[PDB]
């Protein structure tokens, strides 16, 4: 929440103008990231953003739970 707001600000300062990028990496998580992502791109940060997205994906899951889900591929839990 508040942390998220801080993150947006973190990037926002970075929008104005390496360090802020790092600060973002620390914060990265969830849906708000979508909006935040557009911001990363503004200063041509495509490459870092992908690892960012990927790391986040792994961070929530750790780990390999989804793979099991696919194996069954069941609609059940």
From Swiss-Prot:
Phosphorylated. Phosphorylation and dephosphorylation may be important for the function of NUP155 and may play a role in the reversible disassembly of the nuclear pore complex during mitosis. Disulfide-linked to NUP62. The inner channel of the NPC has a different redox environment from the cytoplasm and allows the formation of interchain disulfide bonds between some nucleoporins, the significant increase of these linkages upon oxidative stress reduces the permeability of the NPC. It is found in: Nucleus, Nuclear pore complex; Nucleus membrane. Transmembrane segments: none annotated. Expressed in all tissues tested, including heart, brain, placenta, lung, liver, skeletal muscle, kidney and pancreas. It comes from the Eukaryota. Interacts with GLE1. Able to form a heterotrimer with GLE1 and NUP42 in vitro. Forms a complex with NUP35, NUP93, NUP205 and lamin B. Belongs to the non-repetitive/WGA-negative nucleoporin family. Essential component of nuclear pore complex. Could be essessential for embryogenesis. Nucleoporins may be involved both in binding and translocating proteins during nucleocytoplasmic transport. It is linked to Atrial fibrillation, familial, 15: A familial form of atrial fibrillation, a common sustained cardiac rhythm disturbance. Atrial fibrillation is characterized by disorganized atrial electrical activity and ineffective atrial contraction promoting blood stasis in the atria and reduces ventricular filling. It can result in palpitations, syncope, thromboembolic stroke, and congestive heart failure. This is Nuclear pore complex protein Nup155. The chain holds residues 871 to 957 of 1391 of the full protein.
